[PDB]
Write a protein that binds this ligand. Structure first.
Ligand code: R6B
Length: 137
């Protein structure tokens, strides 16, 4: 079974720490943390073609990409960035991000499928590592 699914979060570490290092102020961090507690995550995968929708009441992100072909999205803190996703295996994709404008910490994300049917999202901003684990429902 591939990345396709409706994914439900079961673990999170260091989400607020991630927003902190990206310069998001306390009140905005509190809104984002509240929204991130209960996201709806939709992934449709066809080979290298991906649709990923992460939706909360206050902020929804939808990206369409092909692994290996560059695209524009936002960083986790809403900064426009150039993205490129590569395979590290059939079960792990790694995305390197470059800001369009301004200055800021180096950002990246990884999505990995475990043999036990979990999805692990890793988001980094310089030193800081945020891990979110999802299961299908
Ligand atoms: C003030 C509100 C509208 N605001 C602006 C600042 C920013 C971009 C940091 C943010 C981020 C989020 C947010 C929520 C969930 C996720 C991730 C969820 C997931 O992948 O499970 C990412 C960002 C929500 C809300 C939010």
């Amino acid at each position: 079974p591939n990345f396709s699914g409706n994914w439900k979060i079961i673990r999170s570490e260091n989400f607020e720490e991630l927003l902190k290092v990206l310069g998001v102020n306390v009140m905005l961090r509190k809104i984002a943390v509240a929204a991130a507690s209960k996201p709806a995550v939709e992934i449709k995968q066809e080979g290298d073609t991906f649709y990923i929708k992460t939706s909360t009441t206050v902020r929804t992100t939808e990206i369409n990409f092909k692994v290996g072909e560059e695209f524009e999205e936002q960083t986790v803190d809403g900064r426009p960035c150039k993205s490129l996703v590569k395979w590290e295996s059939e079960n792990k994709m790694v995305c390197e991000q470059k800001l369009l404008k301004g200055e800021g910490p180096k950002t990246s994300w990884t999505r990995e499928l475990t043999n036990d049917g979990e999805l692990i999202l890793t988001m980094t901003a310089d030193d800081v590592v945020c891990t979110r684990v999802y299961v299908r429902e």
